[PDB]
Design a protein around this ligand. Structure first.
Ligand code: ADP
Ligand code: ADP
Ligand code: SR1
Ligand code: SR1
Ligand code: CL
Ligand code: CL
Ligand code: MG
Ligand code: MG
Ligand code: MG
Ligand code: MG
Ligand code: MG
Lengths: 411, 417
C-alpha cells in the first residue's frame, strides 16, 4: 500500500511490508498492534529472518478520535529526530530502518522483551541501576550538540526553518500543557469530587498563571535545541542494562528545560504515586528514596556531562560563547555556572507545569490512574499538585537539585 | 534587466523607463524631460538614488553582494533587499504614517523603488547633532514601536502564523550573522575590525574585553538575539534609520529585519538617543552650550518609553479577545490578573531594551561602525572624553539594568554620569 496515504491494519501491513524491500529484507508473519500511547498506531512484526516495529500516524489523535485532527506529517519529524538524536546517542535510541512520508510510516528496531515502558517499572517498584547514567548521557548529548554551543547560527537557522513544520503538535502542547489546566475546559478531568477545590485553585492562582505564561512564551519563541518534546517516563523503555528513548514526534527547536523538566517531573510524579502502591510486603519507603537518588543523580550527572561537552568543544564550531571572548578558565566557568543555574530553573518550571497538567488536564499518567481507590489516589495527587504549584512559583530560589529533593521530602 | 546588474546615475534612467511602476510616478513615460538622478547613500550597506522627474520624485535603493562601507572583501547576500521590501510593506501596513510607501520591488535587481522623503526631511541623527528639537518625535516613535512590535508578536499572531513568519525570516541569516559579530562579539575581544579614538580610549577598550560580568550579560543577550522569535523587528533601529521634519517622522532601512527580541529595536533607538546626549558637550559652543538641548533629549527618552509602555498595553487590552494566544482571555480572565501579567511583561521588556541599548552604545564606541554624533567632533581628545562618559554609562547599564524600575530612573542615572 504505497502511492497515497492508506491507514494500515494487521493484514494490509503484510502487503505493504512485502512491497517494501527496506522492511521485508529486515524480517525476511505475526503482527500485533500494541500502541498504548495517546496518538499513534504501533505494530510488532515477526518475522522469519527477524523482527521490527511499524509506527503509523493517522490524521487525528488516536485517544480522542476523529474530532481532534492532527497532521500525519508528525511522523516525518519523529523519524528525523529518531535519526538525529540516534546519531548523537546510538546506545539510547532505536535504529530507524525505513521511513515512508506518504504513508506517515516508520519502520524501526523492535525493543525486545524484557524491555518495558519505564513508567510501568516505576509503578512496579523496580530499580534501574543505569538509568541516571543513561538518561543524563542522552540528554547531555542531544541537547548540547543541537544547541548554539555547537551549531553555528547558519545551520541553527536552517534547522529551525525545518522544525517550524511541526507546528500542529506544538499547538497541541501549547493547549494541553500551557493553557487548559488554568481555565475551564471540557477536556480537563481530575479525581472528583476529591480534587474539585484543587482544580479551581489552579485556575484562580494569579502567580501560577504569570509563571505558566512566561514558560509558554519560552516554548513558543526560544529555539534553544532540538528537543524530544514529550520526554516523560512513558517515552523511555528499559531493562536492567538498556535504556531507550522513543516517540520524539513532538520534537522541534525549543527550550532545553522542556525535555529535562518532562523527564524529572515524571520521576517526581512517580515519587508521589508510591504511597498509593504501598502494600504490607512493600511499603515503597526504600523505593521512594531510590527515586529521589535517581532524580539527584540524573541532574548532577547531566550538569557534569553537559559542561564536559562544552569544555571539549569550547574552541568551535559553536558561536554562543566565542573562545576569544570567554578566554580563560575563570570567565568560562563563571558563564557556565550561570547557564546551568538558569537551565535548572527552566527545567523545574517546565517539570512543575507537566506535573500540573497530568493532574487536572486531559491526559493523565498511569502512576496515579492505576491506584484503584479514588480517595487514596486523590491524596497522592494533591501532594504532587501542591508540590508542583510551589515549584512553578518558587523554582528560582533553588540553588541545587539537592534542595529540590529536600523540598519533595518536606511535602 | 533579466540578470542582476549594479546601477549608476546613467543606467538607472534606462531602468526607470523600462519600469511602468517607476516611470509613471515621475513623468518619464510621457515627457522627454531629462531625469535628475543623484546617488546619495550615506549608510553602511547600500546605494540610494534620488530621482526627480517633471511630475514627481522617488528613491531607488539597490543592494550589491557586499557591504558598501567595507567593499568586496565583505560579501553580503543581495537577498537582504527582499527582506527590506517585505518589512517596509509589513511595518508600513501597521504604521503607514511612519514608514515610506513602497512603489516597486525587483528581486533580480535587488532593487526597491519607494517614496522620497522630501526636504526638509533629514536623518534624525543629523538633527540631534544640529541641536534641533522635534516636538512630535516621542508621540510618533512610541506609536511606531508599539504598532510594529505588538502586531507581529504572539500577543496578536496565533502560533501557526508566527511559525510561518519565522520560517520566512530565517532566510535573512547573513545579516543576522553580521549583527551577531559586530554587536555581540567583536567589542569583547581583540578584532582587526575594532577601532576607537586612540590612544585616549586604549585603556577603556581593554577594560571592555576584560570585564567578566559584562561578558556574561552580552552572552545572554546574544543568545536571546539568536534564539528568541518575539516579533518582527526592524533590526537596525538607530537614529540614522529615522528621517524627520518638525511634523513628520519616518522609519527607513529595515533590511536587517527578522523574528527577534523586541528589546533590540527599542534599545537600538533609545540607546542612540543616549549616545546623542553624551555627544552634545562635544558640539557645544560659547553661543549654544547645548545644556537646554541635552534636557530635551532626556525628556524625549522618558516620553518615548512611557508612551510606548501605555500604548503597547492599550493594543494588548484592545486585542485581548483577538487571535493572539500568548495570554488567552479565559485564563487571564479579569482586569486585575491581566494588568498583573502585563506589568511584569513590560518590566522585563524595559530590562531587555536597556540591555540591547547598552550593547549598541558599547559597539559604536569600540567597534567597526561608529556614529556621526562622536565622529563629527573634530578634536580627538575632546571626542574621547564624551565617548568615555557614554561607554562608562553603557557598561553600568548593561550590567545593572535589572535594578531600574522606570525610564525616569535611567534618565536620573544619565544625569548622575
Ligand atoms: N521500538 C519499539 N520497541 C518496542 N516497543 C515499542 C517500540 N515503539 C513503541 N513501542 C510500544 O508502543 C507503545 C506506544 O509507542 P509510542 O511511540 O509511545 O506511541 P504514541 O506516539 O502513540 O505515544 C509504547 O508504550 C511501547 O509499548
Ligand atoms: N526614502 C528616502 N527618502 C529620502 N532619503 C532617503 C530615503 N531612503 C534613504 N534615504 C537617504 O539614503 C541614506 C542611506 O539610506 P539607508 O536606507 O539608510 O541605506 P543603508 O542601508 O546603506 O544604511 C539615508 O541616510 C538618507 O539620506
Ligand atoms: C490530548 S493530549 C495528548 C498527550 O499525549 C502525548 O503523548 C502528549 O504528551 C500529549 O500531551
Ligand atoms: C560592518 S557593520 C555595518 C553596520 O551598518 C548597518 O546599518 C548595521 O548597523 C551594521 O552593524
Ligand atoms: Cl508529561
Ligand atoms: Cl546602533
Ligand atoms: Mg508515547
Ligand atoms: Mg507520541
Ligand atoms: Mg541606513
Ligand atoms: Mg593608562
Ligand atoms: Mg541599511
Amino acid at each position: 500500500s504505497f502511492e497515497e496515504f492508506t491507514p494500515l491494519n494487521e493484514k494490509s501491513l503484510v502487503d505493504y511490508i512485502k512491497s517494501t524491500p527496506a522492511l521485508s529484507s529486515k524480517i525476511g508473519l505475526v503482527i500485533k498492534e500494541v500502541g498504548d500511547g495517546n496518538l499513534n498506531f504501533v505494530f510488532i512484526v515477526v518475522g522469519s529472518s527477524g523482527s521490527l516495529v511499524i509506527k503509523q500516524a493517522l490524521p487525528y489523535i488516536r485517544c480522542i478520535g476523529e474530532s481532534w485532527p492532527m497532521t500525519k506529517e508528525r511522523a516525518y519529524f519523529e523519524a528525523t529526530t529518531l535519526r538525529k538524536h540516534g546519531n548523537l546517542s546510538p546506545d539510547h535510541v532505536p535504529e530507524v530502518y525505513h521511513f515512508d512520508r506518504t504513508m506517515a510510516l516508520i519502520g524501526m528496531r523492535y525493543l525486545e522483551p524484557p524491555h518495558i515502558i519505564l513508567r510501568k517499572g516505576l509503578i512496579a517498584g523496580i530499580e534501574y541501576p543505569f538509568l541516571a547514567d543513561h538518561m543524563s548521557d542522552y540528554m547531555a548529548k542531544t541537547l548540547f550538540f543541537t544547541s548554539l554551543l555547537y551549531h553555528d547560527t547558519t545551520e541553527h537557522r536552517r534547522a529551525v526553518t525545518e522544525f517550524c513544520g511541526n507546528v500542529e503538535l506544538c499547538r497541541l502542547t501549547e493547549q494541553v500543557v500551557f493553557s487548559d489546566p488554568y481555565r475551564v475546559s471540557t477536556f480537563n478531568r481530575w479525581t472528583s469530587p476529591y480534587l474539585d477545590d484543587d482544580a479551581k485553585a489552579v485556575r484562580e492562582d494569579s502567580a501560577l498563571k504569570l509563571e505558566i505564561a512566561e514558560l509558554k512564551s519560552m516554548f513558543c519563541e526560544r529555539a534553544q535545541a532540538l528537543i524530544h518534546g514529550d520526554l516523560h517516563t512513558g517515552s523511555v523503555m528499559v531493562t536492567q542494562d538498556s535504556t531507550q528513548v522513543i516517540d520524539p514526534e513532538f520534537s522541534f527547536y525549543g527550550p532545553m528545560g522542556f525535555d529535562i523538566g518532562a523527564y524529572l517531573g515524571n520521576l517526581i510524579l512517580a515519587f508521589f504515586a508510591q504511597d498509593g502502591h504501598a502494600t504490607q510486603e512493600n511499603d515503597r519507603k526504600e523505593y521512594k528514596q531510590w527515586i529521589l537518588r535517581t532524580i539527584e543523580q540524573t541532574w548532577n550527572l547531566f550538569n557534569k556531562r553537559f559542561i564536559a561537552l562544552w569544555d571539549q568543544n569550547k574552541d568551535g564550531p559553536g558561536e554562543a560563547y566565542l573562545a576569544d571572548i570567554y578566554n580563560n578558565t575563570e570567565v568560562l566557568k563563571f558563564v557556565q555556572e550561570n547557564y546551568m543555574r538558569n537551565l535548572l530553573h527552566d527545567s523545574l518550571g517546565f517539570g512543575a507545569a507537566k506535573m500540573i497538567r497530568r493532574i487536572v488536564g486531559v491526559a493523565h499518567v498511569e502512576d496515579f490512574e492505576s491506584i484503584e481507590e479514588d480517595k487514596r489516589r486523590a491524596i497522592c495527587e494533591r501532594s504532587a499538585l501542591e508540590f508542583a504549584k510551589m515549584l512553578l512559583k518558587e523554582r528560582r530560589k533553588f540553588k541545587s537539585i539537592g534542595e529540590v529533593v529536600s523540598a519533595i521530602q518536606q511535602q
